[PDB]
Amino acid sequence: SIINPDWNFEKMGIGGLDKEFSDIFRRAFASRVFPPEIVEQMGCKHVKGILLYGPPGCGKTLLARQIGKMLNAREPKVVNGPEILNKYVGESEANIRKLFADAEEEQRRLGANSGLHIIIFDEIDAICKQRGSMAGSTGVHDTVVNQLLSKIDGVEQLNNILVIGMTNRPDLIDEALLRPGRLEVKMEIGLPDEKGRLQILHIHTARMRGHQLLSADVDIKELAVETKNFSGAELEGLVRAAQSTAMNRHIKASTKVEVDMEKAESLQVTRGDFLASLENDIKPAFGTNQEDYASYIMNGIIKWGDPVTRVLDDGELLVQQTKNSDRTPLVSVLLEGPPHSGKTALAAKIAEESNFPFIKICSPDKMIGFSETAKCQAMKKIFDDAYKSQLSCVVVDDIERLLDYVPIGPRFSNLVLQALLVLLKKAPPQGRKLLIIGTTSRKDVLQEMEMLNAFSTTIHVPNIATGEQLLEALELLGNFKDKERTTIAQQVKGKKVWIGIKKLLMLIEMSLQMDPEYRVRKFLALLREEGASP
């Protein structure tokens, strides 16, 4: 026994994970606390390694270091995954072998009284003959893995080691590396919650409070509730950014105004710096991104008719259904209409109004020149990230362009289609929800490919089909005068109008390039030339 019966994890660095320690200690390290006499009388062996997995930057290395410290072990021998890899034949095995030399030597000399040596891996999934199954070429000359196993067990036995593996992709771990006698205790370190964020923020700001540098205006609960899906490292980044911004503001103000030494000595950070840094500096990876919405809804939403309200209300109903419901944790929907009807903007608005913590948009604008396998990898990565949050929402921008559909042929990619069909019918882990929104202009082709049988609902986005609707749209936009509007109404009362909003904006912009006299006739000619008749 070297640690108190209930252990202690607080104000020692790691602050967010206090239940994890108890779980792991109960499950794995019960032999090293009991009096050695009884353990030797029973005749049992200790666990020879554990595995940790979770999102990056959530405090895994700290846990391993503290576990090593609490067991009275020597200095950990850190190592990285990609670092142990070399193209020369029979060189990675050497790197794997050099790590255990000290343990072997001490076992040889001291016999059965040596201490404890702990090896901490990192990105252990890099060396594995399972990533090769996925489309690619990372065979890593399988031999490597075998060598590692031959050192954890085999004919020659080592009884004074402990291997802690850490990974982010728990689905690429070789299955032979989890049998009894090897790494045989798995654990999860997920994102923090309100209390965890509060504790982390309290810990990381303890220095200033001692020296009265921090202002009395700032709270810590407000900043704990404002940050929704922040991880451990982003809070430290936020604190550093606040420090830098406050310092820069203070120096600039002192230079601008010859303030007395009373305030010059003071370097209070206040709360404005924290809010400014939070809203401008840090961009979470597992949270909402308010910058990208303005890249799709460029001119907002204007109500020119009833259909817009219908679509928005149906979206609200779907969001409410997915939020609070059991027996149905996955919901899908599809928006369909003719080209230039404004489907992407409406989808973005529906997603934004949901107030979910995790919102993402998967569009083909960021996949130029990609092979189909890379597209599959990106889609799967987006969905994998979505699966690590309590409430999520994913938008697929264009389903026809993701498949590479061309009417001649026809031609398309089958791998992406099958991946989408599989992913649309896979529920998240227990206790979590999801929502998916589609978008397309060719419903018939999707129906012919048996893809409309996977979605759960469908919505229709119509165009402008009456003169008064066009007049109302122009009035809301505000680009034509009074007599101009009278002339437009007189010439468009015929009611033979069928246009899309995007095309309407383009036509107005083109028509407004002449002197005020000839605008009306040019606009009317352009509109008339587009005389569609469904």
Ligand X SMILES: Nc1ncnc2c1ncn2[C@@H]1O[C@H](COP(=O)(O)OP(=O)(O)OP(=O)(O)O)[C@@H](O)[C@H]1O
State how far the alpha carbon of 59 is from the alpha carbons of 199, 205, 441, in Å.
Answer: 13, 17, 45
Active site includes 458? no
408: annotated binding-site residue? no
- Torsions phi, psi for 53 (to 5 deg): -145, 155
Residue pair 451/334 in contact by the 8 Å Cβ criterion = no
Check residue 62 for interaction with ligand ADP (CB under 6 A).
yes
- CA–CA gap between residue 215 and residue 269 (Å, rounded): 6
User: From the candidates 397, 433, 439, 440, which is the catalytic residue?
Assistant: 397
Q: Would you say 301 or 422 has its CB closer to a copy of itself?
A: 422
Active site includes 384? no
Question: What tokens appear for 109 in the block?
Answer: 């000399």
As beta bridge partners, residue 406 has 411
341: annotated binding-site residue? yes
DSSP per position, 350-407: HHHHT--SEEEEE-GGG-TT--HHHHHHHHHHHHHHHTTSSSEEEEE--HHHHHT-BT
Check residue 443 for interaction with ligand X (CB under 6 A).
no
Active site includes 292? no
Check residue 373 for interaction with a copy of itself (CB under 8 A).
yes
Selected from 25, 48, 61, 428, the binder of ligand ADP by CB under 6 A is 61
Which range of residues in 19-27, 48-56, 217-225, 447-455 is near a copy of itself by CB under 8 A?
Answer: 447-455
- CA–CA gap between residue 172 and residue 184 (Å, rounded): 16
Selected from 33, 278, 312, 449, the binder of a copy of itself by CB under 8 A is 449
- CA–CA gap between residue 208 and residue 250 (Å, rounded): 16
Shortest gap between Cβ of 132 and a copy of itself (angstroms)?
A: 8
Shortest gap between Cβ of 343 and Mg ion (angstroms)?
A: 5
Selected from 12, 44, 135, 264, the binder of a copy of itself by CB under 8 A is 135
**What part of residues 277-316 is at the interface with ligand X (CB under 6 A)?**
297-302, 308
State how far the alpha carbon of 86 is from the alpha carbons of 98, 121, 253, 285, 532, in Å.
Answer: 15, 17, 55, 32, 65
Q: Would you say 226 or 450 has its CB closer to a copy of itself?
A: 450
Q: Which of ligand X, Mg ion, a copy of itself, none does 217 bind, CB closer than 5 to 8 A by kind?
A: none
The residue with tokens 């550093």 is 240
295: annotated binding-site residue? no
* Helix or strand holding residue 475 (H, E): helix 467-477
- CA–CA gap between residue 393 and residue 436 (Å, rounded): 6
Angle in degrees, 0-180, between the axes of helices 61-70 and 19-27, rounded to the nearest 10: 60
Question: ω into residue 82 within 30 of 0, thus cis?
Answer: no
Check residue 137 for interaction with a copy of itself (CB under 8 A).
no
Check residue 458 for interaction with a copy of itself (CB under 8 A).
no
- CA–CA gap between residue 86 and residue 375 (Å, rounded): 29
Check residue 16 for interaction with ligand ADP (CB under 6 A).
yes
**What part of residues 17-46 is at the interface with ligand ADP (CB under 6 A)?**
17
**What part of residues 230-259 is at the interface with ligand ADP (CB under 6 A)?**
232-233, 236
The CA-based angle 310-313-317, given to 5 degrees, is 135
Question: What tokens appear for 244 in the block?
Answer: 């830098």
Question: What is the dihedral sign for C-alpha 308, 310, 311, 315?
Answer: positive
The neighbour count for residue 22, using CB atoms within 10 Å, is 12
The DSSP output letter for 295 is T
Check residue 135 for interaction with ligand X (CB under 6 A).
no
Residue pair 459/314 in contact by the 8 Å Cβ criterion = yes
Check residue 127 for interaction with ligand X (CB under 6 A).
no
Shortest gap between Cβ of 360 and ligand ADP (angstroms)?
A: 22
Selected from 50, 346, 386, 402, the binder of ligand X by CB under 6 A is 346
Active site includes 397? yes
Check residue 377 for interaction with a copy of itself (CB under 8 A).
yes
Shortest gap between Cβ of 332 and a copy of itself (angstroms)?
A: 14
Selected from 344, 377, 390, 479, the binder of Mg ion by CB under 5 A is 344
Shortest gap between Cβ of 426 and ligand X (angstroms)?
A: 12
- CA–CA gap between residue 318 and residue 66 (Å, rounded): 46
Q: Would you say 18 or 352 has its CB closer to ligand ADP?
A: 18
Which range of residues in 10-18, 244-252, 478-486, 521-529 is near ligand ADP by CB under 6 A?
Answer: 10-18
Q: Would you say 150 or 363 has its CB closer to ligand X?
A: 363
User: From the candidates 87, 256, 425, 483, which is the catalytic residue?
Assistant: 425
Question: What tokens appear for 210 in the block?
Answer: 């001692």
Q: What is the largest CA-CA distance in the chain?
A: 105
Active site includes 143? no
Q: Would you say 248 or 447 has its CB closer to a copy of itself?
A: 447
Shortest gap between Cβ of 63 and ligand ADP (angstroms)?
A: 8
342: annotated binding-site residue? yes
Shortest gap between Cβ of 417 and a copy of itself (angstroms)?
A: 7
Helix (H, G, I), strand (E, B) or coil at 170: helix
The DSSP output letter for 434 is E
Chain contacts with ligand X (rule: CB under 6 A):
297-302, 308, 339-346, 441, 501-502
Annotated binding site for ATP: 299-304, 339-346
Chain contacts with Mg ion (rule: CB under 5 A):
344
Annotated binding site: 299-304, 339-346
Chain contacts with a copy of itself (rule: CB under 8 A):
133-135, 299, 327, 339, 364-365, 368-371, 373-374, 376-378, 380, 401, 404, 406-408, 410-411, 414-415, 417-419, 421-423, 425-426, 448-450, 453
Catalytic machinery residues: 343-344, 397-398, 425, 502
